[PDB]
Design a protein around this ligand. Structure first.
Ligand SMILES: [Cl-]
Ligand SMILES: [Pb+2]
Ligand SMILES: [Pb+2]
Length: 139
């Protein structure tokens, strides 16, 4: 519905398999573990559908699916990540885009509220850093 992946100049056959071919996605947690649960997908599976499958498979309750989020995490120590929008197609993004040379990739299930608290956290590490720089200078 808010889909932002598009294929161009393609043929029905290569495009139908691209979207109908099955795949497994290894879905990790925050890093509560180094252990992953394999999640079944196709090129049509949305991030929201795949969050639901992931929670079901973690033995958590899919009712709270809407309060979790799938993340494309580059890192093994995590360094940066991107939150999938609900309508995105993670199986296809997996195929087509990859970590910069040196880094490696993990899809992680994560609670929204843990994501926003991580934004707040990085605003504070920037801001602290600026108030540190400032104090050094004026004294
Ligand atoms: Cl339950
Ligand atoms: Pb499309
Ligand atoms: Pb977890």
């Amino acid at each position: 519905g808010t889909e932002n992946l598009y294929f161009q100049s393609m043929d029905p056959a290569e495009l139908s398999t691209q979207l109908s071919a099955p795949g497994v996605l290894k879905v990790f947690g925050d890093s509560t573990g180094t252990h992953y649960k394999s999640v079944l997908a196709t090129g049509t599976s949305s991030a929201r559908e795949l969050v639901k499958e992931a929670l079901e498979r973690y033995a958590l309750d899919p009712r709270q699916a809407g309060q979790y989020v799938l993340c494309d995490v580059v890192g093994w120590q995590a360094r940066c990540f991107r939150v999938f929008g609900d309508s995105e197609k993670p199986l296809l993004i997996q195929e087509l885009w990859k970590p910069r040379e040196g880094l490696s990739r993990r899809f992680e299930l994560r609670k929204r509220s843990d994501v926003e608290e991580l934004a707040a956290k990085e605003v504070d590490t920037i801001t602290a850093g600026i108030n540190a720089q400032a104090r050094r200078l004026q004294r």
